[PDB]
Homo-oligomer: A and B are copies of this chain.
Amino acid sequence: IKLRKEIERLEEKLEDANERIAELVKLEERQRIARDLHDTLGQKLSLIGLKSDLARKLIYKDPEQAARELKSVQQTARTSLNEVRKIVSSMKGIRLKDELINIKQILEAADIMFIYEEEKWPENISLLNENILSMCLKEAVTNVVKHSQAKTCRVDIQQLWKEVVITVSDDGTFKGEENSFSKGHGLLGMRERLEFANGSLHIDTENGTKLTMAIPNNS
């Protein structure tokens, strides 16, 4: 009865340790995304400094260009603070493999055919870059279910020499009107996240709607 009491006391503290390792393993992956953010905040802060140095030098030589540089400095600080907010809120970063699963189910529930010819999966992008691409792919199909009025949606995920490109095309009609990049909207927010990551967004509304989201590789 003493050793059976002592075994239960050790079984209770081993449950607090092998199970408490699963709680502390969450901080290991959060440190991977925090170090990803710190790396690109270094690039962002260097850009703010250099663009301020340039706008200051232009105050007399070209005051209109100085004002243009300062609108750009303000935007870099606004968007790079939006990313800090995202990791201070501890919002879940989705893996591109998991987001591709959800978009197929969202497109099928809305009765839109999903076209996907699987190729080699991206391997040289950061977890933060991959999380941005997931949010962009999720917003792209959300726009196709609500506005496109398309029969099919072709998604491509490609790993190129210096970047990862995701193309999302629907065979519907683009419902946007002149300023299709309005404040607090998905397209503007996609362009902001992609540009913070040093990637890009290109929209081809000829023959439907084709979003091309590119994001760079590491090293």
A residues 41-75 touching B (CB-CB < 8 Å): 41-42, 45-46, 48-49, 52-53, 55-56, 59-60, 63, 66-67, 70-71, 73-74
Q: Which residues of B contact A20 (CB under 8 A)?
A: 21
Copies in the assembly, this chain? 2
Q: Which residues of B contact A87 (CB under 8 A)?
A: 38
Chain A residues within 8 Å of B, Cβ to Cβ: 14, 17-18, 20-21, 24-25, 27-28, 30-31, 34-35, 38-39, 41-42, 45-46, 48-49, 52-53, 55-56, 59-60, 63, 66-67, 70-71, 73-74, 77-78, 80-81, 84-85, 87-88
Q: Which residues of B contact A42 (CB under 8 A)?
A: 81, 84-85, 88
Q: Which residue from chain B places its CB closest to the CB of A56 in the assembled complex? A: B70
Q: Which residues of B contact A18 (CB under 8 A)?
A: 17
Contact A84–B31 (Cβ < 8 Å): no
For the residues of A in contact with B, the DSSP-based class is helix
Q: Separation in Å of the A199 CB from the closest CB of chain B?
A: 21
Contact A70–B55 (Cβ < 8 Å): yes
Q: Which residue from chain B places its CB closest to the CB of A45 in the assembled complex? A: B81
Q: A84-B45, A88-B42 are in contact. Are A63 and B52 (CB under 8 A)?
A: no
Q: Which residues of B contact A21 (CB under 8 A)?
A: 17, 20-21, 24
Complex CA distance for A210 and B180, rounded to whole angstroms: 60
Complex CA distance for A38 and B81, rounded to whole angstroms: 9
- Contacting A28 at CB < 8 Å: which of B17, B24, B70, B80? B24
Q: Separation in Å of the A77 CB from the closest CB of chain B?
A: 4
Q: A59-B67, A66-B59 are in contact. Are A52 and B25 (CB under 8 A)?
A: no
- Contacting A80 at CB < 8 Å: which of B35, B45, B66? B45
